[PDB]
Write a protein that binds this ligand. Structure first.
Ligand SMILES: CC(=O)Nc1ccc(S(=O)(=O)N2CCN(C(=O)c3cc(O)c(O)c(O)c3)CC2)cc1
Ligand SMILES: [Mn+2]
Ligand SMILES: [Mn+2]
Ligand SMILES: [Zn+2]
Length: 146
């Protein structure tokens, strides 16, 4: 019962977007973006933003620049949770919409329901040479020390 059933496993064959965002509390400066396993990449700079906002902004960018079937890998538990919860709880009784970032999550759900299939997965932030590590370096540049 939702406006969409998110996939339970990654969509085989589909481009994978490793999304990430980072923000500085003291300046409200931040960056959001993605790298994909087909060579794509994009990073945007943001103002008046938060860390949880930039993570949502990266997911929005991934949905805007992807095809009808997309795999999205985030290290943001909040981003995954608030999107999955919004999907799972609709047109039902005891649903109070989130307070903060309500406009951003709304625009994300807008893009989401326009897709064939979407797989959204959480991974812990980690070190290495994988997708989450590359996009982290791109969005942390000038925002936070690595
Ligand atoms: C309330 C509760 O109990 N837990 C809870 C609540 C919110 C979150 S969080 O919103 O996901 N938050 C976790 C700490 N951060 C990173 O560690 C991080 C690491 C990165 O490498 C990175 O690229 C990145 O964008 C962020 C920022 C994001 C996590 C757990
Ligand atoms: Mn992240
Ligand atoms: Mn990171
Ligand atoms: Zn400003």
């Amino acid at each position: 019962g939702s406006m969409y059933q998110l996939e339970k496993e990654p969509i085989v064959g589909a481009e994978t977007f490793y999304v990430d965002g980072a923000a500085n509390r003291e300046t409200k400066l931040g960056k959001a973006g993605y790298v994909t396993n087909r060579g794509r990449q994009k990073v945007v700079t943001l103002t008046d933003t938060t860390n949880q906002k930039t993570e949502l902004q990266a997911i929005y960018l991934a949905l805007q620049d992807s095809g009808l079937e997309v795999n999205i890998v985030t290290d943001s538990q909040y981003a995954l949770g608030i999107i999955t919860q919004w999907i799972h709880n609709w047109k039902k009784r005891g649903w109070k919409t989130p307070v903060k970032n309500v406009d951003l999550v709304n625009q994300i759900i807008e893009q989401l329901i326009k897709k064939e299939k979407v797989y959204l997965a959480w991974v812990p932030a980690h070190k290495g040479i994988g997708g989450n590590e590359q996009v982290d370096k791109l969005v942390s540049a000038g925002i936070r020390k690595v």
